[PDB]
Amino acid sequence: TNFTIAGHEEFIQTSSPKVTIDCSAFVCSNYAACHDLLSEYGTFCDNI
Amino acid sequence: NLLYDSNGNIIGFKDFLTNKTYTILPCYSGRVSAAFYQNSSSPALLYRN
Ligand SMILES: *[C@@H]1O[C@H](CO)[C@@H](O)[C@H](O)[C@H]1NC(C)=O
């Protein structure tokens, strides 16, 4: 018999933070022997 | 004499000769973004933040 208007809200996620990681600053930040050893176990850093 | 955190790092100490305190903070370390064109001679550098 009688009506009204109701409102609702909805949120849908469409994005995410873009995270970038490197091999040097993570494994061999400031060590030369670390780099010399990492250069022999295969890079895998190009793949990451 | 020494100040530690939950991870075991050193973030402070106390001098023995002068009996004064200090704080230890890590130094800057980061990468640089370079925008390079096909037949360019030198890319454009951007030091973020
Ligand atoms: C419907 O509800 C509104 C707000 O309460 C009121 O102003 C109106 O008179 C009502 N209509 C009827 C037919 O009851």
Curated annotation (Swiss-Prot), chain B:
Residues bearing glycans: 19, 39
Domain of life per record: Viruses
Biological role stated in the UniProt entry: Attaches the virion to the cell membrane by interacting with host receptor, initiating the infection.
Protein name from the UniProt record: Spike protein S1
Annotated source species: Human coronavirus HKU1 (isolate N5)
Residues of the full protein shown: 646 to 694 of 1351
